[PDB]
Design a binder for this molecule. Structure first.
Ligand code: SPH
Ligand code: SPH
Lengths: 64, 178, 128, 59, 252, 278, 111, 56, 178, 252, 59, 64
């Protein structure tokens, strides 16, 4: 029962991969990774990763 | 080449057939991907209307023995993108001779029907195209490197103006920075 | 009452000590080694309580020296004045024998990437 | 103790307004959004031996 | 012809035969502090020509895959004679600078350098929430080197050329006083910085005034047979320097 | 606008003029300009002694007392509250006034009134907006004894009515003193035989304030708390005084616990720090 | 300033208009430690009171800096030995704001 | 009210005056008016750099 | 010695070796423990910025036959506290001869980079040190007491200024005084 | 009264209440070198008030059987801040000096000092035909001590008070600029030496300009009960100093 | 019946304001925070036979 | 290095901070006990005569 984050930010063009999409209990420092929603393509100038910070909120994630 | 310094280096070499193309992009400072994050583009993305002429400077960063000519051309919209050299020489072009003065200025004038154009993408205020064409070739002597690099600049003239304050589409924040 | 003072941390050889908020009870100091050196031990210490006084939580760390490995020998060519240990920013100059022609840069130098010694480029070659 | 300036208006087709300062401090005043001057001679052309723009400016 | 330029300061002289044009600042020439903007009360020390003269820094070698170099100038001139000593005995200081960067090649070489003076270049750390050591920012007269890929050395500056350490686009660094060393036509990277700070006099060790950067955009490239070793030498002279608040020997 | 004095330049000196050697035994503060001992330069100084003046030092709205009273209590004495007017029950404004010995000013008075619903069983009500009355009694007048007394009928006494939700009440009061200035310190007695009460308590004589809810007895208890903010203005002060070191004990005298002069040290000389290591 | 009634069992109340206090502390002053502290008595500190339902509070503040201008970027250290904290964090020194409800403890939670 | 700069008319040219060929190596932004390379007309321009100022 | 009159008496006697130290403190009127509760410090703790020069007066309250010299010295910050007499004679010092004029004035000038310094403790506006050193000795004749007392004063010049009203950190109240 | 004297130089001040009269030189006040008598060609460094200020030397204790002390002043001021540094980076130097010697007692003490500035005091060796070490001539800020009887330490100065090291009668040393510190009525051993040499500028380390000597003729003597420790402090300030011929760091 | 004074402003780089008194009493007026004069000649130098500061001021 | 020999102990009085080795120009300061009176100089120092270490004078005395 450590401190945990919320569900990661639902983007309208990106969904989570499949070790992360089911499991709860995101501790601090945990990185999660997104994949393109099926019909889309990657923007190579942006890295699709999100770190949960000390204040139990994810980093800013906009459009991957 | 975005993740290096090679985004700024335009390739140029000696060509086995003249009349080819060198590069090209769309004249939209703030919407087009080429001059999006430039100084003029980053001042210009906090606005929503712009007007005035735009300068373009081409520094040839090659050998001192190399020589050749280029065709720096602007074509107003209404037709398509030009596909030959003889279709792009109908626009507003300049022939640039590489010599001791190593840089030229392509000044793109203000050809519009409205007093302002939008900094974003809409079809009513399309703005034209900038293309560059090999005029003859690059000619080098022996034991001099053929493949050189042209650098492109951009600036505004003394009649450039912006109108509508909006927020930039590039600032993004998810939580407070602590 | 008022806070007690932990003792003066002093100096680390080839390193810093950063004291942002004094050395009173509940403080924090940090540790960092210079260029060409690697930190071994702790990266921060606290002015906690130890017994009847206040002490530091972690002992003083050490700055060892980072070395690039042995320079590569080129075929048909020697090194002008080969040293035994090569630290940061230090370069070897490759000469070349009689009847053979150099190709490329003469000298390569030592770099540190991911806290590991590494030469900057490939060594040159003599064809003849 | 009022002062009268001009309103910002369109071109090609001088209306006045009034302003009175009420408070004792200079930080209390309204913002000065009517200074339109400029001088881009320190950012552009930041050189010595000022060029001519008609000469080649070298040799 | 205007390709020739002589610069005389103190007892040192730099002559160039392939100069292009000397840049001077934001339009402002360096000058001593007037007594209408001054804050300190005791008599300042405008020493002599003993500090207003050219000092030669170390040379870096420009290879085919080199990326960039930087210096920190109120700290880089810390051991150059009486400038370094007057730095070490005074509390306040104030000076403009005349930077002259040399690099030469033949007419068969190609490559282009960018020489910028960046005021208040606050560097970013490699790993994010971690302190920076003083040796990784400023190494005296020795240049620190950018990289091409992102770096992850502990307590180090994030050193990628496409962000220039500060976190901006490197093609936007032409807003500061700058020139280009095009090997086709230049050797004159001369930039006369005035004093730029938000206090009329400042400490030399605690505050870094600006940062010289030499970033090659069009890389050095040559045919086989030419001289492969091309050095770059940076020469810097303080101008209109004065000092105030004398006390004992400082922090080395 | 009166700027501070400037620094004039100086040079070397070798003479029988000695600005440094003075006699501090003559009750005299020496007037050594910094240009008299060291060589100085011309500094045109632009500093203004503006926010150190007595008006800029005292004219802030300080706080002097808190007053609590209920609107439904079984005892009739907690349905209203009083306060004899002095400025000596909060230490900050008292110490700031005790910089000076005699003062003379007008008072701009503000009340900040807040009501809290007390705890009861029937706590779900629908209460209209409360109305307060703040009545001033000059020294000697008739005093109320209940909330429904007819002494509250304010025919001559100045009283201020306030409705909950608006701006706080504010009124100015002129120099209400019988002497030529107020007395912060009075070293004397009340009776001519040098008996009686000692100190500044003989010279207060300011009258008192009275507070009640104008509304009738509600069906649920509500307490209200009113904070009096005095704010001196048009201020003059005479014969200054060293600031008080020890802490106050009462409002009617200057009696104190003996405190030392300052915070202690460990030794009489200074040196470099003896903490951890290099 | 906006208030939201939090979730509780006794959610049906009759609450009067809330009153807020916004206190500014200059750099170095005394800081409060509770809502009923006597450090809130604002004798010298500028503080602003507001009643729910009116126009928002507004006040101007002059150039509160010790230098000749503000510094967005500071390339230096805090200590003269070139140690300590790096960057613009040495030059903030602005003091801090404190916020509380002027009313007493209500019978239902309101944020 | 400080208007933007106007465009002056021009004509054909065949001379040793070269506004296009500059040296961008001298830290210098070239100041080529649009009436210096192409033939332009007289345009009396009424635009104001108002809402680009630092205050605005 | 806080709980007596002996806090104000600085000891001085004849020393068996010259060049020693007499006292010393840190020039912070309102933060340093020495001049904290002084008149200048109590005016100055209701503020938050100060500027201008500060005077220091040293009355020698000893015998009329006693004589000797002292070294009243101010050292601007940036280095450490001086540890010898020959390091503290590099600062802004004055040599004071005890004679018929029994008091001297050490005027500490305004050496800063900012127009104001904070009355509290921060590292950006450190202000220097005041030290005093035996220049020769105290020399007395027979049947005259050796151990005497120096008294120190403090004041402000005619260019002293304060800026930001705050409350004093010394006023403390728990309940109302009744 | 003329018993009071204030001397202000740079940022230092000496006040005396029992002075008698300030001596100044051979009639000449110190002044910078004119350009009609100058030899070197480059621009001299007249630094600031950063060197023209009082520096305090170490104190010697005057006992009942003490004999004398001496110093060597272009060498004794070798570590006093920026004077010492400008000595160590320049080849030539030139300066006058203002020497202020302190000593105090009570009215029940007795004793008399002689304070002379002796130009070109070429010392003699103890054993005759033998070299002299540099530490026995000048010991920095530390005074060397004469003796009463003749001395015979190897590589040492012949140090007898009745010959003053040079080989003359010590009662004839009142031909140089001098005063007396009579403890009855003095503290003002002030002597403003001009620059005295046979070349217009000279080296600071290789040449010693003059020698201060404090020789007690009427010895210190007191009754039982008075303070037995009477120190003597020597304070010296260079005046009108200027420097020429900058090069790297000198000989320590 | 208005009166115009100057606003307190910074130095080295005269703006006016207006004030009208509305009430019949002198205690009603705004506080006078613009009197900057001083005279520290009664607290410092509080003596007879005024000293010179260059003389020793004794004997 | 030349050393003066061990400093003489005085009757009814101690040395303030007695060091082990005494080189050139170095002095010892004699204190004195409770109930005894100093006579003469407090401190003697080390001299070199005929290349030999030697103290400068006789040590003081405490009578009481
Ligand atoms: C209807 C509203 C009237 C409110 C009455 C409240 C204030 C009236 C009392 C006069 C205020 C006098 C202020 C204190 C005077 C002296 O300075 C103090 N005794 C301290 O010396
Ligand atoms: C009673 C109301 C007082 C409210 C206090 C809130 C604001 C007071 C702080 C001063 C505002 C300074 C604004 C920031 C200054 C600089 O621009 C920043 N450090 C960024 O450079």
């Amino acid at each position: 029962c450590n401190r945990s984050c919320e569900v990661p930010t639902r983007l309208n063009s990106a969904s989570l991969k499949q070790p992360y999409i089911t499991q709860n209990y995101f501790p601090v420092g945990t990185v999660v990774e997104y994949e393109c929603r099926p019909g889309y393509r990657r923007e190579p100038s942006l890295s699709p990763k999100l770190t949960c910070l000390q204040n139990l909120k994810w980093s800013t994630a906009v459009e991957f | 080449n975005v993740n290096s310094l090679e985004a700024y280096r335009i390739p140029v070499h000696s060509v086995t057939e003249t009349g080819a193309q060198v590069f090209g992009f769309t004249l939209q400072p703030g919407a087009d991907t080429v001059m999006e994050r430039t100084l003029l583009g980053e001042i210009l993305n906090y606005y929503a209307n712009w007007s005035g002429s735009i300068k373009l400077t081409f520094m040839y960063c090659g050998s001192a023995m190399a020589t050749g000519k280029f065709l720096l051309a602007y074509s107003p919209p209404g037709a398509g993108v030009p596909k030959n050299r003889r279709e792009a020489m109908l626009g507003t072009h300049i022939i640039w001779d590489i010599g001791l003065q190593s840089s030229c200025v392509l000044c793109v004038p203000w050809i519009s029907q409205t007093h302002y154009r939008f900094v974003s993408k809409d079809i009513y205020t399309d703005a034209g195209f900038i293309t560059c064409w090999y005029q003859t070739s690059i000619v080098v002597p022996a034991e001099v490197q053929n493949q050189s690099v042209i650098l492109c600049f951009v600036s505004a003239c003394n009649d450039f103006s912006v109108r509508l304050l909006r927020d930039s589409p590039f600032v993004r924040q998810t939580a407070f920075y602590q | 009452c008022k806070k007690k003072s932990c003792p003066n941390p002093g100096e680390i050889r080839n390193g810093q000590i950063d004291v942002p908020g004094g050395i009173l009870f509940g403080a924090t100091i940090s540790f960092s080694c210079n260029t060409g050196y690697k930190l071994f031990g702790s990266t921060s210490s606290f002015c906690l309580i130890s017994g009847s006084s206040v002490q530091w939580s972690d002992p003083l760390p050490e700055c060892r020296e980072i070395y690039c490995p042995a320079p590569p020998q080129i075929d048909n060519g020697i090194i002008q004045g080969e040293r035994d240990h090569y630290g940061y920013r230090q370069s070897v100059t490759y000469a070349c024998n009689k009847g053979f022609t150099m190709i490329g840069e003469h000298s390569i130098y030592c770099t540190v990437n991911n806290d590991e010694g590494e030469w900057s480029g490939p060594p040159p070659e003599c064809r003849g | 103790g009022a002062q009268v300036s001009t309103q910002k208006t369109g071109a090609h087709e001088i209306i006045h307004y009034t302003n009175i300062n009420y408070y004792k401090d200079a930080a209390s005043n309204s913002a000065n959004r009517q200074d339109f001057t400029q001088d881009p001679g320190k950012f552009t052309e930041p050189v010595k031996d000022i060029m001519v723009k008609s000469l080649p400016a070298l040799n | 012809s205007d390709r020739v330029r002589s610069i005389t300061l103190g007892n040192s002289t730099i002559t160039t035969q392939e100069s292009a044009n000397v840049v001077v600042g934001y339009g402002v020439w360096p000058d001593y502090l007037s007594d209408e903007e001054a804050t300190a009360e005791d008599q300042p020390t405008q020493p002599d020509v003993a500090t207003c003269r050219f000092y030669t820094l170390d040379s870096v070698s420009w290879m085919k895959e080199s990326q960039g170099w930087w210096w920190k100038f109120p700290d880089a001139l810390r051991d150059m004679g009486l400038f370094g000593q007057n730095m070490q005995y005074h509390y306040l200081g104030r000076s403009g600078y005349t930077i002259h960067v040399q690099c030469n090649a033949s007419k068969f070489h190609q490559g282009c350098l960018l020489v910028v003076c960046v005021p208040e270049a606050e560097m970013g750390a490699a790993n994010i929430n971690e302190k920076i050591n003083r040796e990784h920012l400023s190494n005296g007269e020795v240049a620190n080197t950018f990289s091409g890929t992102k770096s992850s050395n502990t307590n180090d500056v994030q050193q990628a050329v496409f962000n220039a350490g500060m976190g901006v686009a490197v093609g936007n660094l032409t807003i500061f006083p700058h020139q280009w060393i095009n090997l086709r036509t230049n050797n004159c990277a001369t930039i006369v910085m005035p004093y730029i700070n938000s206090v009329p006099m400042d400490n030399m060790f605690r505050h870094y005034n600006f940062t010289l950067m030499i970033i090659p955009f069009a890389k050095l490239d040559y045919a086989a047979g030419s001289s492969t070793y091309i050095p770059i030498t940076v020469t810097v002279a303080p101008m209109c320097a004065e000092y105030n608040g004398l006390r004992l020997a400082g922090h080395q | 606008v009166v700027r501070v004095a400037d620094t004039m330049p100086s040079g070397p000196s070798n003479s029988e003029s000695i600005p440094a050697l003075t006699a501090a035994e003559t009750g005299h503060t020496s007037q050594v300009v910094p240009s008299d001992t060291i060589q100085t330069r011309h500094v045109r100084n632009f500093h203004v002694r503006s926010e150190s003046s007595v008006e800029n030092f005292l004219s802030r709205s300080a706080c002097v007392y808190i007053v609590e009273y209920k609107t439904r209590d079984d005892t009739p004495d907690k349905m209203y509250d009083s306060w004899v007017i002095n400025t000596r029950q909060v230490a900050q404004l008292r110490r700031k006034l005790e910089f000076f010995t005699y003062v003379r000013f007008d008072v701009e008075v503000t009340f900040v009134i807040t009501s809290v619903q007390d705890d009861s069983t029937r706590q779900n009500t629908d209460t209209p907006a409360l109305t307060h009355q703040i009545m001033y009694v000059p020294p000697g007048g008739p005093i109320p004894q209940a909330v429904d007394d007819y002494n509250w009928q304010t025919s001559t006494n100045p009283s201020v009515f306030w409705t909950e939700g608006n701006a706080p009440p504010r009124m100015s009061i002129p120099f209400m003193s019988v002497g030529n200035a107020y007395s912060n310190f009075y070293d004397g007695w009340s009776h001519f035989s040098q008996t009686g009460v000692y100190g500044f308590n003989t010279l207060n004589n300011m009258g008192k304030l009275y507070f009640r809810h104008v509304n009738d007895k509600t069906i649920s208890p509500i307490t209200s708390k009113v904070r009096i903010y005095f704010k001196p203005k048009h201020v003059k002060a005479w014969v200054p005084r060293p600031p008080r070191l020890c802490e106050y004990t009462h409002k009617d005298n200057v009696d104190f616990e003996p405190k030392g002069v300052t915070t202690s040290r460990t030794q009489l000389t200074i040196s470099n720090s003896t903490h951890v290591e290099n």
